Amino acid sequence: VNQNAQALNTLVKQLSSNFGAISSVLNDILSRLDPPEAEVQIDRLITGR
Amino acid sequence: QCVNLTTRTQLPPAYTNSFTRGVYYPDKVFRSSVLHSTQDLFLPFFSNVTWFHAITKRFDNPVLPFNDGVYFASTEKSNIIRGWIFGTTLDSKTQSLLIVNNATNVVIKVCEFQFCNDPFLGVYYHKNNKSWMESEFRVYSSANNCTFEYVSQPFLMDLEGKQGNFKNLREFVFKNIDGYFKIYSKHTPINLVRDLPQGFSALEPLVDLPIGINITRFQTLLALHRSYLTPGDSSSGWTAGAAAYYVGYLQPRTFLLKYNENGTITDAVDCALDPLSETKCTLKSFTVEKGIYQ
Amino acid sequence: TSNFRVQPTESIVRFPNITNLCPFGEVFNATRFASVYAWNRKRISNCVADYSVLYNSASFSTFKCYGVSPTKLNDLCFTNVYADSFVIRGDEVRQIAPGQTGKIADYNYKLPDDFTGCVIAWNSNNLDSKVGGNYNYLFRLFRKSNLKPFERDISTEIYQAGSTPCNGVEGFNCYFPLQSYGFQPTNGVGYQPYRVVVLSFELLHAPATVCGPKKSTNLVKNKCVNFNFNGLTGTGVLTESNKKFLPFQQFGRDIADTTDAVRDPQTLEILDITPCSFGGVSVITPGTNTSNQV
Ligand SMILES: *[C@@H]1O[C@H](CO)[C@@H](O)[C@H](O)[C@H]1NC(C)=O
Ligand SMILES: *[C@@H]1O[C@H](CO)[C@@H](O)[C@H](O)[C@H]1NC(C)=O
Ligand SMILES: *[C@@H]1O[C@H](CO)[C@@H](O)[C@H](O)[C@H]1NC(C)=O
Ligand SMILES: *[C@@H]1O[C@H](CO)[C@@H](O)[C@H](O)[C@H]1NC(C)=O
Ligand SMILES: *[C@@H]1O[C@H](CO)[C@@H](O)[C@H](O)[C@H]1NC(C)=O
Ligand SMILES: *[C@@H]1O[C@H](CO)[C@@H](O)[C@H](O)[C@H]1NC(C)=O
Ligand SMILES: *[C@@H]1O[C@H](CO)[C@@H](O)[C@H](O)[C@H]1NC(C)=O
Ligand SMILES: *[C@@H]1O[C@H](CO)[C@@H](O)[C@H](O)[C@H]1NC(C)=O
Secondary structure (H helix, E strand, O other): OHHHHHHHHHHHHHHHOOOOOOOOOHHHHHOOOOHHHHHHHHHHHHHHO | OOOOOOOOOOOOOEEEEEOOOOOEOOOOEEOOOOEEEEEEEEOOOOEEEEEEEEOOOOOOOOOEOOOOEEEEEEEEOOOOEEEEEEEOOOEOOOOEEEEEEOOOOEEEEEEOEEEOOOOOEEEEEEOOOOEEEEEEEOOEEEEOOOOEOOEOOOOOOOOOOOOOOOOEEEEEEEEEEOOEEEEEEEEEEOOOOOOOOOOOOOEEEEEEEOOOOOOOOEEEEEEEEEOOOOOOOOOOOOEOOOEEEEEEEOEEEEEEEEEOOOOOEEEEEEOOOOHHHHHHHHHOOOOOOOOOOO | OEEEEOOOOOEEOOOOOOOOEOOHHHHHOOOOOOOOOOOEEEEEOOOEOOOOOOOOOOOOOEEEEEOOOHHHHHHOEEEEEEEEEEEEOOOHHHHOOOOOOOHHHHHOOOOOOOOOEEEEEEEOOOOOOOOOOEOOOEEEOOOOOOOOOOOOOOOOOOEEOOOOOOOOOOOOOEEOOEEEOOEOOOOOOOOOOEEEEEEEEEOOOOOOOEEOOOOOOOOOOOOEEEEEEOOEEEEEEEEEOOOOOOOOOOEEOOOOOOOOEEEOOOOOOEEEEEOOOEEEEOOOOOOOOOOOOO
16 A cells, blocks of 8 residues: 555656756746747656656 | 943853744745645754843844844843844945834835944933833934835834843844845744743744845844933943843755644754754654664 | 546636836836946836737837747736846847857846846937947946856956056056947947847746736636636636635645645635546447447
């Protein structure tokens, strides 16, 4: 039980990482930016997750 | 005007220990029933804090370095402590903050000041009518220019000397980050006289001001008592009264904070105090079972 | 086979009720601008700013935004916007930007590596050209060390090129770091003066002081809706909450980083946010051979 809960907690906590982008929230990247500039940072987030 | 006070005897400084004091709310987010790790400027646990007691005449008004931050704790019973000045040089060449709680109200003015050598607030006591009225304002000579000013709403306080014991403790944290002067405050009723209490109480944010000035030195302001009993001029005819305050300095540290169901900090773990605290940090818990841990 | 999701019914925008306008007139329509070595900084707060104007009008020479897109500036709420004003040469317009080292960048004005703001520059040759030479604008050339970002130097001391310390003689290998621009109408376009303003804004969890000219709508509850609380965009179900926010707190993050509670700007109410319904969808079949029912 402890191992399963720990694995899930790590999986959920991993969403907060930037992985190199400006922010870890997609809704913030989608605003503040035009698609050609947003696509690269969305790519970085996709690769990390 | 400025007068250099006399009849003051210098004594060696005194030091005491801060037992789990100086913890404040780091940000404005609400969290409940969690253990949260924060890296910020904090007062390390079990640390030397310089203790000043005005009682020789013990006119304790020394200029002190600001450093990265300040934790100021005053045990008060007669409102002797009034305010503070914060200035790089304080010679009117470099602009200086002043936060003064005068009889009428709190006044937060950032203005170039020609500060006096021995600033204070002289309150006079009359025997024919038993009352205390502020009369002397020796903080500064003149104000060249006032970029920032603020006067609060008027209020009335006793301003009367008390012959009892210290009954209230006022804790403040002052910081200058990102051109912002942040003041955190709290007050707690305690009956201790000469000992800093050993307990935990978080400090809620009080005010964030966009002062945006360079500070490397500060000074406190006291309420001077003058009456018929004390004869002499302004430099000699006075008595200090009874007051006590403590000064400590902030350092960059990591803390583990526990929130309860109501979202209030109840306990904290200083991460680099000793190995057991480091294991508590690593395990993200306040209880550690038997074994060997990396 | 697939997945099931409930879709939003409507969208709601809740922005603070401020009718004040931001003093862009003082910034751009100023009769005089300071020198590059001492740039002028202004703070703009508690006002509504429309960036649609000043972008499609006045024929600004350069309008370059780092970290934001101008079309979206109407839809964003900002905290503590700063405006920096100075006058430079044409080619130096390139130097003032993230990276892009140059004499102006090295010794006059350095932008931070991580920048979120808009640089506006326009040609003011007619205003700042004198037939005898506009010498009121000066620039720094010789400084001991590279400037840190968002820092200015006003020290005027004789620069020592090599050995033989100057001691205020301005002799051989001793030059004044400050030199006067010579601006005349009969000059090349690259040599013509240019007026530059830099708008820099900080995105912070603190309540947003400046907000775009976007209207608000009525609150709706108990339905899957889109919400735009102060630039915080999300989709979910809003309900009344019993969480006990302290007055300084505005958001709630629960255990992870996602927001689960919020404070309505206009009515100061605490709202719990829940995700819309989702789940898998499965098909039970007895086999196409037996039947086609599922
Ligand atoms: C206090 O002493 C300083 C230094 O000696 C002097 O400049 C100042 O005039 C004195 N102030 C008085 C005597 O009021
Ligand atoms: C620091 O704390 C220790 C605790 O034993 C004390 O002896 C000492 O006087 C304090 N001050 C300094 C400057 O060491
Ligand atoms: C306190 O300061 C305020 C603001 O300068 C002033 O208006 C008021 O008269 C002062 N009161 C006293 C007791 O000096
Ligand atoms: C400060 O005051 C002096 C004297 O009135 C004046 O000459 C100077 O320009 C002022 N400076 C500022 C920044 O207001
Ligand atoms: C503040 O002033 C002190 C003394 O004048 C100086 O050493 C320090 O570099 C200054 N800091 C800033 C940020 O200007
Ligand atoms: C939270 O506040 C309520 C209301 O005062 C109180 O009854 C309750 O004991 C508090 N919870 C804790 C853990 O102190
Ligand atoms: C400057 O003044 C002109 C009128 O002379 C006006 O059209 C323009 O909007 C003004 N600009 C600002 C930023 O106020
Ligand atoms: C405007 O907002 C304030 C809170 O900031 C609120 O108290 C007030 O009732 C609102 N007025 C309107 C026009 O809704």
